[PDB]
């Protein structure tokens, strides 16, 4: 109908509220396609999951996006130069349960930071959340396979599950490491996120902190009781993150 009036309704995130959300896209037959979530952590740096990188591909990240089906003027498109990807050296595609599933992408040209686009807030090293911590996932739902994807940025209340609550044999057993965060695990769904998407938590300050980086979900679905969305603890990788940004 030409530009239909913007309707935020249902589980749509408030436009631009999650201002550090980013979209990692691969090139294909001339066009890019959303593949993972990510968080703008530095003027010209982005953190996302390690498995979202396929070295043989051309990537770009989109900033200031909400409705992927509608140009809105806030979007910024940044082509990611050949060798500007940065997967952790310990990430091993043959042991997902081993953790260390993180990576960083240096932007070719720096983000225009403003009211609509903003830098995330990283936890302090080794920082750890309490059981039942009230965190919010955000994404375009690619974690979900059985149905059509959202055009608008979505969100969900995925309260974290502490280690000794996420380790219990009938949950994620010996598969979960002290380097990962679990969120949800109940009737509340986790399908509104993307691989590499943020697990934002409300800091002790009022501001929000990117505590996680979506790694994996259950084979049975992104909404399986006792099998919470496993995230990579972005605090365990504070040393690494900083040097990479530094040394490069």
């Amino acid at each position: 109908s030409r530009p239909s009036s913007r309707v935020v309704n249902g589980e749509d995130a408030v436009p631009y509220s999650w201002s550090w959300q980013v979209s990692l896209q691969y090139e294909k037959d001339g066009a890019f396609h959303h593949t993972c979530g990510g968080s703008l952590i530095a003027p010209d740096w982005v953190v996302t999951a390690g498995h979202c990188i396929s070295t043989s591909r051309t990537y770009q990240v989109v900033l200031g996006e909400y409705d992927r089906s509608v140009l809105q003027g806030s979007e910024q498109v940044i082509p990611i130069n050949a060798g500007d990807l940065f997967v952790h050296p310990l990430w091993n595609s043959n042991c997902v349960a081993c953790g260390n599933d993180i990576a960083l992408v240096k932007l070719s040209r720096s983000a225009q930071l403003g009211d609509k686009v903003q830098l995330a807030n990283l936890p302090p090293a080794g920082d750890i959340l309490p059981n039942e911590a009230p965190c919010y996932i955000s994404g375009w739902g690619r974690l979900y396979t059985g149905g059509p994807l959202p055009d608008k940025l979505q969100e969900a209340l995925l309260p974290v599950v502490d280690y000794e609550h996420c380790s219990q044999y009938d949950w994620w057993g010996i598969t979960v490491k002290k380097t990962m965060v679990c969120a949800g695990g109940d009737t509340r769904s986790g399908c509104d996120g993307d691989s590499g998407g943020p697990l934002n938590c409300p800091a002790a300050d009022g501001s929000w902190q990117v505590h996680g980086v979506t790694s994996f979900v259950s084979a049975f679905g992104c909404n399986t009781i006792k099998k919470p969305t496993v995230f990579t603890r972005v605090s365990a990788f504070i040393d690494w993150i900083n040097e990479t940004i530094a040394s490069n």
Partner: protein, 94 residues
């Protein structure tokens, strides 16, 4: 045409009948959209499968969690197809 960017073909090895029934308990899971190149058979034989990118991590941890060994045969299927298609073009005439 179909999109295969980031897909991967894995070589699963179910040591014994038990490990075989569990890789099959993943076949029933229609939502994963597995493309079994060398579907399940007698234990010992290889099980080659193309697992789509969105079902990539979930399939692995499923495997890992069950203590089932797999290696990655093809890391990115689209890139192969991309080569094939490029050879064909380079070699076309009447």
């Amino acid at each position: 045409k179909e999109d295969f960017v980031g897909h991967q073909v894995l070589r699963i090895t179910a040591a014994d009948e038990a490990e075989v029934q569990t890789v099959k308990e993943l076949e029933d899971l229609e939502h994963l959209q597995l493309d079994f190149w060398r579907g399940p058979g007698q234990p010992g034989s290889p099980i080659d499968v193309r697992v789509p990118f969105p079902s990539l991590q979930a399939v692995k941890v499923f495997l890992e969690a069950h203590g089932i060994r797999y290696r990655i045969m093809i890391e990115d299927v689209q890139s192969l197809l991309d080569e094939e298609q490029e050879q064909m073009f380079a070699s076309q005439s009447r």
